């Protein structure tokens, strides 16, 4: 039984684990703590890039954004290297997805604009996709830091799975913009040890990870079977029992994904 397996993983990793896989015509939804809130961490970058793509003509990707020393205040593997030249919106989208670049995410929030440095407009974008649960309240790095149980900067496995389903498999974006989002997630550099690790090599996986304080580790993915049948997989976790400095445990996500893959294979 899946729920027993997931509960065993929670005990193993001193963690809280949330899992959602939407139903298909032949598979029931998989749910474990699916409606409990967990911090987004960088998983929000996927719908953030969708929002920026949706909002603008595609040639907005070529607009140069300049930024300075006081803009680098979070892990930013790409933006730190390009601070002297600026980055285009397309480069920012690439970095935000593929490297979880926090400065890139903050600059994209600013590009979206409006109250809360773009966080209200981001939340509004999710509302437009029928998500009345998720909320973004802070930028990077603060959005990773809310205490366990705090609702700020949270989604749920169920909510984020349904959002990602619309973005990747549905019609939230026109095909040209959808392809940009999907390809950036396909070329992600941060997810090899999470959902990807739980699915056989002949399944395709595209994903966006998140990692935060209090042992937070997330991954949201779309996977395709070897015959092209897609599934959406959201796995979220935290480790409040270890306090603020608890390490994220990628292996919890890999094991959870292995259990999911066993059901879907
Ligand atoms: C196993 N796993 N999976 N996901 N997260 C983890 S471990 C959590 C984690 C730790 C930690 O110490 O344990 N960190 C560092 O150490 C910091 N390194 C950097 O800030 C920086 O060098 C960097 C950031 C990103 C890419 C390359 C370089 C960060 S990176 C996040
Ligand atoms: C997804 N991909 N990329 N490279 N190889 C693949 S798997 C082959 C494939 C499958 C399938 O059932 O094998 N598809 C879907 O599922 C249908 N749509 C989407 O995936 C779609 O919502 C989307 C359309 C346009 C741009 C981005 C996303 C098609 S797309 C072709
Ligand atoms: C309960 N127990 N007993 N023995 N092993 C365990 S649990 C295994 C384990 C976990 C874990 O994931 O569970 N860790 C963290 O999280 C990491 N802590 C830090 O990075 C940080 O707080 C720190 C870095 C340097 C000096 C002091 C603190 C390491 S500690 C090893
Ligand atoms: C790829 N890699 N390689 N080694 N470790 C990695 S992890 C990939 C990664 C992700 C992610 O998308 O999973 N991130 C976030 O989410 C952002 N979290 C924060 O900035 C954050 O404040 C924070 C960072 C670390 C510890 C506690 C809080 C960053 S951090 C880098
Ligand atoms: C670019 N790169 N190189 N290697 N991995 C990478 S990817 C980024 C990354 C870095 C880094 O260097 O940025 N890491 C550390 O530093 C390690 N942190 C720890 O193991 C950890 O917190 C710890 C636990 C217990 C005691 C002491 C330290 C890992 S975590 C992954």
Curated annotation (Swiss-Prot):
Residues the entry annotates as binding substrate: 100, 209-211
PTM comment text: Exported by the Tat system. The position of the signal peptide cleavage has not been experimentally proven.
Known EC number: 3.5.2.6
Location of the protein in the cell: Periplasm; Secreted
Active site residues per record: 42 (acyl-ester intermediate), 140 (proton acceptor)
Segments forming a coiled coil: none
Reaction catalyzed: a beta-lactam + H2O = a substituted beta-amino acid
One GO term of the biological process aspect: beta-lactam antibiotic catabolic process
Broad class of enzyme this protein falls into: hydrolase
Swiss-Prot/TrEMBL keywords: Antibiotic resistance, Hydrolase, Periplasm, Secreted, Signal
One Pfam family cited in the UniProt record for this chain: Beta-lactamase2
One Gene Ontology cellular component: extracellular region
InterPro entries on file: Beta-lactam/transpept-like (IPR012338), Beta-lactam_cat (IPR045155), Beta-lactam_class-A (IPR000871), Beta-lactam_class-A_AS (IPR023650)
Notes on activation and inhibition: Is inhibited by clavulanate.
GO molecular function: beta-lactamase activity
Positions marked as site (Increases nucleophilicity of active site Ser): 45
Residues annotated as site: Functions as a gatekeeper residue that regulates substrate accessibility to the enzyme active site: 75
TM stretches of this protein: none
Family to which the UniProt record says this protein belongs: Belongs to the class-A beta-lactamase family.
Cross-referenced NCBIfam families: bla_class_A, MTB_classA_BlaC
Subunit structure: Monomer.
Role description: Extended spectrum beta-lactamase (ESBL) that inactivates beta-lactam antibiotics by hydrolyzing the amide group of the beta-lactam ring. Displays high levels of penicillinase and cephalosporinase activity as well as measurable activity with carbapenems, including imipenem and meropenem. Plays a primary role in the intrinsic resistance of M.tuberculosis to beta-lactam antibiotics.
Protein name in the entry: Beta-lactamase
Gene it is expressed from: blaC
């Amino acid at each position: 039984d899946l729920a027993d397996r997931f509960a065993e993983l929670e005990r193993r990793y001193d963690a809280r684990l949330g899992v959602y896989v939407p139903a298909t015509g032949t598979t029931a939804a998989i749910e474990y703590r699916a409606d409990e809130r967990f911090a987004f961490c960088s998983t929000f970058a996927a719908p953030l890039v969708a929002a920026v793509l949706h909002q603008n003509p595609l040639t907005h990707l070529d607009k140069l954004i300049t930024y300075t020393s006081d803009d680098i205040r979070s892990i930013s593997p790409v933006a730190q290297q390009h601070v002297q030249t600026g980055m285009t919106i397309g480069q920012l989208c690439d970095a935000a997805i593929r490297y979880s670049d926090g400065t890139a995410a903050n600059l994209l929030l600013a590009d979206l604009g409006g109250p809360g440095g773009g966080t209200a407009a981001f939340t509004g974008y999710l509302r437009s996709l029928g998500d009345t649960v998720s909320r973004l309240d802070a930028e990077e790095p603060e959005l990773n830091r809310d205490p366990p149980g705090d609702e700020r900067d949270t989604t749920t496995p169920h909510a984020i799975a349904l959002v990602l389903q619309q973005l990747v498999l549905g019609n939230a974006l026109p095909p040209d913009k959808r392809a940009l989002l999907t390809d950036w997630m396909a070329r992600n550099t941060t997810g090899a040890k999470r959902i990807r690790a739980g699915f056989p090599a002949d399944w395709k996986v595209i994903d966006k990870t998140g990692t935060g304080d209090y042992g937070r580790a997330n991954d949201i993915a779309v996977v395709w079977s070897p015959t092209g049948v897609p599934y959406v997989v959201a796995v979220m976790s935290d480790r409040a029992g270890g306090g603020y400095d608890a390490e994220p445990r990628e292996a919890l996500l890999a094991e959870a994904a292995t259990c999911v893959a066993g059901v879907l294979a």
